[PDB]
Scaffold this active site. Structure first.
Site, PDB file in Angstrom:
ATOM      1  N   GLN A  19      -4.444  20.603   6.533  1.00  0.00           N
ATOM      2  CA  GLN A  19      -3.409  20.044   7.402  1.00  0.00           C
ATOM      3  C   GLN A  19      -2.266  21.034   7.728  1.00  0.00           C
ATOM      4  O   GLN A  19      -1.426  20.764   8.604  1.00  0.00           O
ATOM      5  CB  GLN A  19      -2.847  18.744   6.757  1.00  0.00           C
ATOM      6  CG  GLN A  19      -2.114  19.056   5.469  1.00  0.00           C
ATOM      7  CD  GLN A  19      -1.419  17.876   4.895  1.00  0.00           C
ATOM      8  OE1 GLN A  19      -2.028  17.129   4.169  1.00  0.00           O
ATOM      9  NE2 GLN A  19      -0.164  17.670   5.248  1.00  0.00           N
ATOM     10  N   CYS A  25      -0.635  14.112   6.595  1.00  0.00           N
ATOM     11  CA  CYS A  25      -1.611  13.526   5.651  1.00  0.00           C
ATOM     12  C   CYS A  25      -2.086  12.115   6.001  1.00  0.00           C
ATOM     13  O   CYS A  25      -3.254  11.802   5.828  1.00  0.00           O
ATOM     14  CB  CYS A  25      -1.061  13.476   4.235  1.00  0.00           C
ATOM     15  SG  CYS A  25       0.511  12.618   4.076  1.00  0.00           S
ATOM     16  N   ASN A 175      -8.814  15.625  -0.599  1.00  0.00           N
ATOM     17  CA  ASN A 175      -7.495  16.068  -0.164  1.00  0.00           C
ATOM     18  C   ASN A 175      -7.629  16.912   1.127  1.00  0.00           C
ATOM     19  O   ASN A 175      -8.746  17.314   1.556  1.00  0.00           O
ATOM     20  CB  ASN A 175      -6.810  16.856  -1.326  1.00  0.00           C
ATOM     21  CG  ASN A 175      -5.257  16.959  -1.202  1.00  0.00           C
ATOM     22  OD1 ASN A 175      -4.643  16.406  -0.309  1.00  0.00           O
ATOM     23  ND2 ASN A 175      -4.637  17.646  -2.156  1.00  0.00           N
TER      24      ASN A 175
END
Ligand SMILES: [Zn+2]
Lengths: 212, 109
Positions: A19, A25, A175
């Site tokens: 990201q 996120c 993640n």
């Protein structure tokens, strides 16, 4: 439900993304669920556009933060384009959906998992990848290199990620910090602690797309 | 205040040995980026020259990805000019495209 679940093994999880320094996120988290449910229903694994959610979710604030449920709500209402059609720039720009032709996929709705309940979350993960939130600002989470994580970390959530599986004593989490973090980009968070918030607040707020 | 912020990047501050210097920089650690000395630590590169305490203040907001503010509370230990050199980065990665740098010089007589 199974003793172990891992959606990457079923071809329902795309590679780990990065990201950047953008506070996106919330959008990355949502897109993992969409990618997952489209594979489950259609048999195709596609990548969908975090950038579009960033630019187009009027309820969120671009790189200044947002809500995975709000991104899912957008995709249910208007749909979403492919990643190659609408690539990640890691800064918010104008909403360019209308310049991109018809949406690639649209979901049928958004559902929340009963919160603060480990069993409810595991049942949902056994069905499909789920958008989840946790407390990830701590140094030990930043420096995580692998293993089943029990902390330290707090309970005031601040990061959105996606649960793509579990086992007897962990939940498997994708993640969005690149593959150089954690277990090739993943973290296994301890489960079965009896704490209803979950480890790092993992049971606080979990959502998944409905799609027939 | 006498808080040092991004607007003071590159500045020299004249300080007393033993004086706590207040540094506050925007930080969004749930991106994986935060402010570090070289090597990826919050610790003074030379404890003989200055000491550093660090604290992160989240916004009081439920928005996921809303940035907060990192404080560095810096104490000068020795006379001299001491460069406090920080980089906004993923500490397991080192500097990257999105990284930024912040320097302040603390001149103690
Ligand atoms: Zn302070």
């Amino acid at each position: 439900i199974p003793e172990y679940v891992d959606w990457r093994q079923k071809g329902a999880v795309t590679p780990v993304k990065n990201q950047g320094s953008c506070g996106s996120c919330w959008a990355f988290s949502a897109v993992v669920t969409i990618e997952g449910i489209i594979k489950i229903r259609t048999g195709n694994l596609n990548e969908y556009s975090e950038q579009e959610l960033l630019d187009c979710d009027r309820r969120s604030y671009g790189c200044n933060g947002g809500y995975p449920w709000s991104a899912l709500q957008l995709v249910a209402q208007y749909g979403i384009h492919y990643r190659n059609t609408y690539p990640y720039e890691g800064v918010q720009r104008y909403c360019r959906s209308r310049e991109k032709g018809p949406y690639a996929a649209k979901t049928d709705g958004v559902r929340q998992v009963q919160p603060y309940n480990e069993g409810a979350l595991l049942y949902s993960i056994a069905n499909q990848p789920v958008s989840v939130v946790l407390e990830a600002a701590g140094k030990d989470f930043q420096l995580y290199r692998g293993g089943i994580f029990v902390g330290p970390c707090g309970n005031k959530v601040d990061h959105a990620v996606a649960a793509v599986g579990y086992g007897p004593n962990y939940i498997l989490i994708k993640n969005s910090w690149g593959t150089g973090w954690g277990e090739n980009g993943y973290i296994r968070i301890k489960r079965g602690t009896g704490n209803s918030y979950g480890v790092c607040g993992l049971y606080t707020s979990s959502f998944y797309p409905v799609k027939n | 205040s006498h808080k040092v912020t991004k607007a003071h990047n590159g500045a020299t501050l004249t300080v007393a040995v033993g004086e706590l210097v207040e540094i506050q920089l925007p930080s969004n650690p749930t991106t994986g980026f935060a402010w570090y000395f070289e090597g990826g630590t919050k610790e003074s590169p030379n404890e003989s020259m200055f000491t550093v305490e660090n604290k992160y203040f989240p916004p009081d907001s439920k928005l996921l990805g809303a940035g907060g503010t990192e404080h560095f509370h810096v104490t000068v230990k020795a006379a001299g000019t001491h460069a406090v050199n920080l980089t906004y980065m993923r500490p397991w990665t080192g500097p990257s495209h999105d990284s930024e740098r912040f320097t302040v010089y603390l001149k103690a007589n």
